[PDB]
Amino acid sequence: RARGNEYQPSNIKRKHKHGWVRRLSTPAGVQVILRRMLKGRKSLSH
Amino acid sequence: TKSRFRPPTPEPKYK
């Protein structure tokens, strides 16, 4: 069919997957935050 | 094919 519309926005899905609490759950996720703080990013997560 | 673009900056010129 016609591709390009994979993104089907849902705030509950978004926040669970890439949210603050989700990132802090695992050390591998906390190290994602730690690098982002090093670079200077405006937003560390969703 | 590839894809990249540039912004139309507001460019206020009133000096």
Add this chain to the structure above:
Amino acid sequence: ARNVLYPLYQLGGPQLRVFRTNFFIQLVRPGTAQPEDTVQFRIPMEMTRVDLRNYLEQIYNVPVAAVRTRVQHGSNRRRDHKNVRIKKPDYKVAYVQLAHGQTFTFPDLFPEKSDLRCPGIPSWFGL
């Protein structure tokens, strides 16, 4: 009061008194058409409709029969010279219906109340 700590209340606690208040409010002319009794206020976002009733009745000695409030979303669409969105501050609008048949309308502030024949030759010269 805003940006201050409210003591935690447990059964049998004293009444909470705020002697000096951080909430400052402004009365605005209605955008739409409102009933004569209804009065509009812009108030700090941390103020409750209950506080406004107490706020007006005690500080201003105004009888209030009902209060209704809403939270207004400020625009975040305008971009500056660096293409950074500017956010218009969100504010709280309060609708206050006066009591005892009292009537109020916003006052109207600010009652405010050559020589064609000789073209282009300097007229200073007498010659």
Add this chain to the structure above:
Amino acid sequence: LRNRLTDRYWRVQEVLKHAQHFRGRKNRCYRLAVRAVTRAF
């Protein structure tokens, strides 16, 4: 950019000054004039 050629203007002029009487882009473009001039010489 410690060292850059500040006199490349005159190097192009040497080739171009021998191409003014030509017709077309060869009289004004160095990539095209230079080839035209060598045959002329």
Add this chain to the structure above:
Amino acid sequence: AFVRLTLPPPKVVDRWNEKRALFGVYDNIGILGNFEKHPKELIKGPVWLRGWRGNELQRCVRKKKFVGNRMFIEDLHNLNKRISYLYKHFNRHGKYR
């Protein structure tokens, strides 16, 4: 090409300032001073290349030896990669064998 439409400012050098006037003094401190100090000891520069010269690969390794333990993580990482690139160049490439 394009060239400046105005002359740049004149550059004036004072050749009798204190640094230029006394340049070179004490270069013979050793032979004329009973060899108390070698002239190499008068050089002001990086600790790892005062009185020493070598090619970049040698220079890279020498910088590591003196201040390898006092370097920043990113700088040390780049130095290690710079050494490994030079090693394969000087020891595996080049016209002559």
Add this chain to the structure above:
Amino acid sequence: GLEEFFDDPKNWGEEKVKSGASWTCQQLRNKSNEDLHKLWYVLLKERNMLLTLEQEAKRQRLPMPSPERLEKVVDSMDNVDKVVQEREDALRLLQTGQEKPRPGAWRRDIFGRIVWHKFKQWPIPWYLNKRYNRRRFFAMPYVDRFIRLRIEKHARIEARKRSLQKKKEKILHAKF
């Protein structure tokens, strides 16, 4: 009443309004707490009126008469806040000696930084509170590498600033 929000009816429609000087911090100190409590509400009503008037000017797209009045009132209210807080702060030091009014402690987050933690009011002790035992005030070894990098990043930034100031002195001495 509601009329207090608007200014004196006569003053409406005048380009400029005369205003006295604002209250200084030293003068407020001489006043007793009774006056400070009373004075605050007097200023509060003044602030509301000017906020009411200034906002109305935007609707009419006309310049506010005597805009300087609001700054004087706001500065006066801040001075009253300063005096009262200073009086209370001194009393706390005498009776207790604690520097700050609210309890807090120096603690480390999971991101390897020292953060001043402000305490909150709770109805149960900390060891029985299951929301407190989700917050973490310690760091695992994996934050060790990132801790050093912040030291170096700040060290780089500090070094550049010192060098930059040195150049600016050179330009000044060359100029003069």
Add this chain to the structure above:
Amino acid sequence: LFRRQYENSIFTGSKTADPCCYGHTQFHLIPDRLKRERLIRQNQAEQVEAVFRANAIASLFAWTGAQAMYQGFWSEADVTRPFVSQAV
């Protein structure tokens, strides 16, 4: 007073097939929030009797209005015989 879109219903308390279609009297109970003492504290003393008037006008018109539709009268065809109902 807000707006929603749900089913419009003209119901007299019973379907059209019911033999009993007219009305005699209605009994309404004012909710606790609207009782006399609560209104006084809220400072809306005048509304002590206004609450009664609002319910009487609203409910009786709905009941009588629904009755007319059962007899077949609607907006264009005005009611020939007035419809009367009571409420307490």
Add this chain to the structure above:
Amino acid sequence: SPFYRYGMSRPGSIADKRKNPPWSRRRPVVVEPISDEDWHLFCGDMVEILEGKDAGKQGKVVQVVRQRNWVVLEGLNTHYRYIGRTKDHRGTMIASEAPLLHHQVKLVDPVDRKPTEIQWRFTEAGERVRVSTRSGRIIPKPEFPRADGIVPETWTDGPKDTSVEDALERTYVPRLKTLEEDVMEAMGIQETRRFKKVYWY
């Protein structure tokens, strides 16, 4: 901001917003830093023009932009411009003063009209005063109207203004009671309940 040029218009006016837009990146001005103690030029002081169009003409300082080390003298170093120009009318020609750097002017001996250099020195009372390098003398600070334009002595008490005596009145009584405890006693509020224990953490 790093890119902000101070001009002649008072900051925050329409002129200063027009000259310095947020995107301005004009070449910085290099100004010889001058210590607060070092500066000796103040509004109202008569000074003499060392060099320029009006060199040797004494004038009165009327403005000091210390950010640019500028001193502006009334009616001197003055060029011409049109004020109030409109589409209908040309306007009124006026002569506008231009800023002068400090080193281009000198202060004047109070008694005698000469450009006497001065040095900062204390007095018996301890107040800092400017003293002439030669013919040592005390040049008083020149009284000048305030920028806001309000005149204290002629100011007349009006509504919303406290009387001078009332402001001077002192009624604070030092006591180990907070404002939260003084008001209740004065206002007669009585409360006998006490807050329950709270576990701060």
Add this chain to the structure above:
Amino acid sequence: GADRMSKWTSKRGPRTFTKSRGAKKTGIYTSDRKFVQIKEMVPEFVVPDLTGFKLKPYVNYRAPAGIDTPLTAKALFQETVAPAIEKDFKEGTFDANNLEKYGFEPTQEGKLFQLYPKNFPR
């Protein structure tokens, strides 16, 4: 495609997602989804009587301001408690145990307005 830079507020998200704008709570939610307001949790503004008040928002320019001296604990002690102790010391009627006689509070517990931790707002 979600905007990461805008603040997360209750206007956004589904119906279920809600949060406050910072308004202080004034009641309790009991079982069966019933709200029960508590009068004590509702702040009460203590407003003084302004009759006969001689202070207005603005001050006269003529009035001269004084020297700023931030109040310090030592200064307050000298004014209030020192004179009592000094006179008592001459009379000899002073002891360490009765510092409360001059106004000392051993513990803030039992005070309506606790100095630390503060139990009263501005």
Add this chain to the structure above:
RNA sequence: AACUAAUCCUAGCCCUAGCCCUACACAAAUAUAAUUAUACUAUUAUAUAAAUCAAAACAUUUAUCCACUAAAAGUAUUGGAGAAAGAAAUUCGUAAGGAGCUAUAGAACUAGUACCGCAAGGGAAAGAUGAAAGACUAAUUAAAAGUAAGAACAAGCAAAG
């Protein structure tokens, strides 16, 4: 006889030297779907670095990656004894500057921003008057390609004699 344009100098940067640190930012909020004033379900890094690459393949192996300068010494040793690797004993030592960059350069940086990706993440571009703009924003230039001023006139690598 000019349009498009071009000219420009300081914003900052780079490498050293010296130097551990004691820049941990009112008040309020945030680990809940972060930045939502109070109880519910409580909270905790990792077993040996691999491979590319070299040995003209590849399979043991392959400097750095992974403890003071100089000398002993590329020596003794180690190694499909091949490519290659490589000591020690023992001697010696008191240790603010620029033949750097100047807006396609120097950092990616005016900014980790805009923009792009669900996310990890990737990642820009540009500015230029004067002492004074409370002097109607200067200048400066047959100057790039591109046009115009001024379409063309049998025949041809467009020129040369």
Add this chain to the structure above:
RNA sequence: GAGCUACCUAAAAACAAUUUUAUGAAUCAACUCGUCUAUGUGGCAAAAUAGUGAGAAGAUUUUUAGGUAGAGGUGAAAAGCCU
């Protein structure tokens, strides 16, 4: 990285009329799918449009949240899918 897609768990929703009967049966919409031809081809479209076709009470379609992750996952096996 499973908001696309393969699969699964949980909580749910849609199915008119007609004939059979008592159903992975029939005619045929909504709805799901994508046999054929034509146009399009930097297109409306990085897979569409116009017709024509298949299923349409079921191994049915759809909605919401969650789970399975690359030495792997899923697979009515096309080495098909996993932005």
Add this chain to the structure above:
RNA sequence: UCUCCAGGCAUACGCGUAUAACAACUCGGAUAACCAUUGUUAGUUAAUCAGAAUAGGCAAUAAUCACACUAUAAAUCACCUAUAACUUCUCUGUUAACCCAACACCGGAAUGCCUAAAGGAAAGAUCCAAAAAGAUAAAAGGAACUCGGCAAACAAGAACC
């Protein structure tokens, strides 16, 4: 006012001021008028709509108009026993032509009710060329076309491998 077309009003998920008036006429709409664009000012008002105390004891008997009728795939807190508390209105959502597709994209998008009472406009002015695309009509013949009855048809029937 006339001519003609036939998915429309709400809800959820989503989006985040694109809503509305005024003023501008640089930019955006692939052109104009007008604004969806720029700037300023406004806006969405709920006890009913929507969202967010403790310890025990014990449940054989679907749904389908649930009666009849059968079947098989076997199918949605309450009520008690005791303890504790005895009179409350705060907070948040509410606008729009809107979302996923770089786009004012002939595409994708769930539920409720209804099918015009709601919602809309295929043609900027011209002109009648070839070629190309689509629709309709056909003297006689009736697959003689073609790899093949592909496409089309006033046909849409029958049998076979």
